[PDB]
Symmetry: D2
Subunit: 247 residues, 4 copies
Amino acid sequence: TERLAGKTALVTGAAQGIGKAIAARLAADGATVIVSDINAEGAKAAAASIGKKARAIAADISDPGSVKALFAEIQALTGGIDILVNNASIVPFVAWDDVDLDHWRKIIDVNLTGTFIVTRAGTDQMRAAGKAGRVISIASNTFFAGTPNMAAYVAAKGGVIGFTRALATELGKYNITANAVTPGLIESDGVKASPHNEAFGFVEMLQAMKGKGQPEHIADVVSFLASDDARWITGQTLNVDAGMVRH
Amino acid sequence: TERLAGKTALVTGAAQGIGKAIAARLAADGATVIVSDINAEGAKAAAASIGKKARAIAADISDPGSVKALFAEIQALTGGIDILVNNASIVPFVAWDDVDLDHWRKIIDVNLTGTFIVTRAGTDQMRAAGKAGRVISIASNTFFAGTPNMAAYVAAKGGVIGFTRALATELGKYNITANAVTPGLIESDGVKASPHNEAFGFVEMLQAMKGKGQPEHIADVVSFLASDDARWITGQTLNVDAGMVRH
Amino acid sequence: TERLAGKTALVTGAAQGIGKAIAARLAADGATVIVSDINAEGAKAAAASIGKKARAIAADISDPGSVKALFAEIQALTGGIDILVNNASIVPFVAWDDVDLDHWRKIIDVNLTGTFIVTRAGTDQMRAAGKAGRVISIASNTFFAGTPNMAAYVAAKGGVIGFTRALATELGKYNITANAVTPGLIESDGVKASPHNEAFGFVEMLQAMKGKGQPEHIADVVSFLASDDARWITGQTLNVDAGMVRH
Amino acid sequence: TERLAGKTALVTGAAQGIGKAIAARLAADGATVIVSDINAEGAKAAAASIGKKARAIAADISDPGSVKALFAEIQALTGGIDILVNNASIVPFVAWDDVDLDHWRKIIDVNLTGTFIVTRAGTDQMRAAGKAGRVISIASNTFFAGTPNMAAYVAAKGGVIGFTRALATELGKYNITANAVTPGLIESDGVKASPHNEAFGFVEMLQAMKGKGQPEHIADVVSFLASDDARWITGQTLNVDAGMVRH
Ligand SMILES: NC(=O)c1ccc[n+]([C@@H]2O[C@H](COP(=O)([O-])OP(=O)(O)OC[C@H]3O[C@@H](n4cnc5c(N)ncnc54)[C@H](O)[C@@H]3O)[C@@H](O)[C@H]2O)c1
Ligand SMILES: NC(=O)c1ccc[n+]([C@@H]2O[C@H](COP(=O)([O-])OP(=O)(O)OC[C@H]3O[C@@H](n4cnc5c(N)ncnc54)[C@H](O)[C@@H]3O)[C@@H](O)[C@H]2O)c1
Ligand SMILES: NC(=O)c1ccc[n+]([C@@H]2O[C@H](COP(=O)([O-])OP(=O)(O)OC[C@H]3O[C@@H](n4cnc5c(N)ncnc54)[C@H](O)[C@@H]3O)[C@@H](O)[C@H]2O)c1
Ligand SMILES: NC(=O)c1ccc[n+]([C@@H]2O[C@H](COP(=O)([O-])OP(=O)(O)OC[C@H]3O[C@@H](n4cnc5c(N)ncnc54)[C@H](O)[C@@H]3O)[C@@H](O)[C@H]2O)c1
Ligand SMILES: Cc1ncc2c(c1O)C(=O)OC2
Ligand SMILES: Cc1ncc2c(c1O)C(=O)OC2
Ligand SMILES: Cc1ncc2c(c1O)C(=O)OC2
Ligand SMILES: Cc1ncc2c(c1O)C(=O)OC2
């Protein structure tokens, strides 16, 4: 019991929403959890709320130097991560005709390229420390649905799934698995503060089970993927959306 | 875990291999487990290997009367199942030119239709007992790979995935989820006694992770799918094959 | 406009609906087309309606003796098929609680097992002649959507996709390709006469493109799959539904 | 004459390889073809290889100014495109430990962001001209396979698939479809000059049908997707790889 005792997990974007919930669950599982977010004040509050097992370290996942500093600090405090959860992203609501190159570049730079930057450093850290590892990246079921008003975001999330599939092949020899989770619409802090909050009616209509998805619905699946129970799973995408789509 | 304390799980085809391991893990999780198999001697041995949480009840999943008797005995003993694992199947090795109608019908009748027979009765039992429930069906990653020497089997397993997707839609309103697992090649009792045993070299070379797949690799994933951690997952297929294919 | 000159194509279930439209297009492409249906009078009428090189031969795809007779007559009339289109199926509307074993068996027997019976005989006929043929099976996008009121049908169509993937592997060495098409809701004769006709409003609203799907939408895709332009495609499923789902 | 008579198709990266083959086939189908490549002299040479129906216009797809100038010229020559084929990309061979941020950014910038830049301008041009349109983007079956030595490329191609699915939803109302093709390994000019040339043994081993994939294998499928026969297909990905993977 406390299956993650002695393990260190980094969760990016963990100041609020799904990321905070993931960090809370991994901490309850026994892990030392690094709560990282570009919002430093938010990260501090999130780590404090989780208690004990959690430490806040601010980072911008799109900034290579910021990420290098993040991992240097983790190495000094813990000896290196065992588990990486790529959760940070911008979740936009943008009409197609408002998707210009500036918007596109920003979404790709954070959501896709930031994910690479963090994964590059994190898996290099696992390997240097001789740790079997787990990479878990939060994508989105919009990749399956073709959801409107998010074109750059859907592209970036498809990139995260592609990256995951290739990464699994590259890292298997190091005993590191790489999987993705595709949440459906979740009632996170960020969604409640955006026009996506108005999408619950349509989404629930398409779900096989009713109710608004919650951050804990995703956190509890990430817990499984971080555990030894998922040791034979790599390169896969697990869709968690009460059945809005079927993968 | 004990997370399944007070729950009842039926595992079909549990005399040996993957089914036995699934039964063993669900019992370790705390469930009362019904070990069912057409091989009554084997079911008895498997239940004895697991201990007091397991009870052997023989059944042929393709025989509606045999299945009715199975569920009547489960109802009398436990008040009804909470969890159904559809694991029973024939795993053939048959060259395409040896796939005649007799062979086709037999594989379809057990692997696909038997799965319906058991699921019909089992989910009706859950509903009658006002139980939230979990249906978990073992398919095969051959559905993704188009593996040779198993044509009727691959068809049947595609049918199980299709059935799972429709069932998730039909049963969501009764708080019952329906998911599938696709194992890759697993060193089960049945595989070891078949020409499929010689596929391990080629499969392991195509895997991202090293090693021959084991029954426990699948059992531990079914544990997750039977748990509350998977409560927001329905209609989905989780591929467990050390990366031979990517889903 | 004559790319199929010299080729012979068999289309099952071709008395009406999608089947007839497929037969009509392949005939326009220049092929000798065998219009086959369990409705013997209907098969004759549709072949006469198409004219060109169309000929009718009645058959029940679920009856191996009937199919044997079908292929004997085809061999005698044409020298054997180059192209097989598995289109015949029963399209039910049945509430889940009305899906009993009798219903399930019938749908699996015709839609899945009938597809095997025809494919067994048809691809054997191709091979006997040394032809680099084409197997194209009509499945359904309900396999992706988990559509309600069709549980046995969705299972059968998943079986057809599984069968297709395995068959591509088995027959590639004989230069025979095997692919599947998944239509969305189509305004066929059969659909117009069923409660499925009422699904058009919901379906069109979920489609990316406007309009009710027509049999010719599917026929024109099957034409491509039967042509040399599709020569490098095998084992694949092409979804044709104006974007209701994304495959 | 000629399915695409009166139509204008732009093919990017068309100086050599698959792009040249696509441009050639669309010209044979009757379209006026804009042969575009970052290699200006290469674009001129390829247009000359096609003949009177081709016009060469140089452009770097990753450069917004270059792409806008490309479309400004097309508008003056033809009144605007009906068909866009996003074919330009870098196809790298790079060991995982050589995948650094500079490499990642370059691949994403050209293969994914360039695809957006061209599609943004191209579909805006279709709409301004009041033309029903077809967008066809060339991805890669590495997205399905998780192919090694190409990690950024696999991510970028996953992005193209995601983008395609969202774009279909955004543009259906304007009667523009958007689909993707995933080629398997193809003996293109570019592959012949790279370490991927050494992959044919392994790839052919996994293929259901034997032989090295050729540019025409892809061109002939793109022809179908550009035609009216594909009018009911949008948001889909068509895999063209002699069965190396099954989609
Ligand atoms: N909520 C949903 O409906 C939904 C659905 C599918 C997928 N997702 C994914 O789940 C993840 C979390 O989503 P959420 O709804 O909880 O988001 P949220 O907006 O509530 O929180 C996102 C967090 O990420 C942080 N962040 C943003 N950019 C960052 C960067 N450059 N570096 C470090 N941190 C950064 C923010 O500060 C914020 O704390 C995201 O990957 C999102 O794409 C969400
Ligand atoms: N082992 C693998 O490589 C592999 C891979 C993918 C999927 N699977 C699936 O996993 C499941 C278990 O596989 P396994 O390798 O452990 O099989 P196995 O051959 O070792 O055991 C199968 C059990 O099912 C029972 N059974 C067969 N027909 C039955 C029927 N009519 N009614 C009741 N019981 C019946 C047998 O008696 C046997 O005890 C099957 O569904 C199989 O299709 C196995
Ligand atoms: N129409 C749709 O919305 C739709 C959607 C997805 C898939 N499909 C598939 O398309 C195919 C054609 O459907 P349709 O709507 O044109 O059907 P339809 O009902 O209009 O026509 C089907 C034809 O098949 C024949 N048939 C039935 N059982 C047969 C058997 N045992 N042997 C030989 N022939 C038999 C019937 O006589 C009929 O002529 C089917 O495979 C169906 O599952 C249809
Ligand atoms: N060849 C394969 O095995 C294979 C497999 C799967 C997918 N693909 C995809 O097919 C497409 C064509 O591949 P190919 O093998 O024919 O490539 P190739 O290398 O032979 O030709 C690529 C062409 O694109 C041009 N190009 C590169 N960057 C450009 C840019 N910034 N702007 C404009 N043009 C640019 C090059 O000048 C070249 O003429 C690519 O999208 C590739 O990813 C190829
Ligand atoms: C189905 C769905 N709807 C809205 C949103 C998402 C989603 O997956 C998402 O990831 O961000 C917003
Ligand atoms: C990859 C693979 N190889 C062999 C077998 C299976 C499989 O999935 C299977 O389910 O039964 C035998
Ligand atoms: C989406 C959808 N709706 C209704 C029907 C089908 C379908 O695919 C089908 O194949 O038969 C009826
Ligand atoms: C299977 C496969 N092998 C090598 C390559 C590709 C591919 O799809 C590709 O797109 O570029 C190189």
